Amino acid sequence: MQFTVDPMTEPTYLMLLFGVFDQVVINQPTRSGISVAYLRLPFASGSA
């Protein structure tokens, strides 16, 4: 995608946001045995 914004006089950013899910499961199976598994979707951050 591409934008055509009004020209300002000093440089700016473009805060683009992508709607994703961002989920956390967390379980305690044993005393002092805490463990999570993060999974955000589609822009996952855990590949091989």
Partner: protein
């Protein structure tokens, strides 16, 4: 008391080999299991490659 001196320790006096000595106790040799067959080894390569980032683990049999 000197009637029971077990007379093949006196034969090899100061020359005792391994079968005449009291050893520290311990079991025989069992081979080490395959670390591929660990409970969380392959599934960490599968659940992460689905897109997850993992952190956390279950304590061992010794609880540490």
């Amino acid at each position: 008391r000197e009637e029971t001196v077990r007379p093949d320790l006196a034969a090899s006096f100061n020359d005792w080999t391994y079968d005449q000595l009291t050893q520290p106790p311990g079991t025989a040799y069992l081979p080490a299991p395959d670390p591929l067959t660990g409970p969380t080894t392959i599934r960490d390569k599968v659940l992460s490659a689905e897109g997850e980032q993992l952190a956390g683990s279950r304590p061992s049999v010794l609880h540490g």
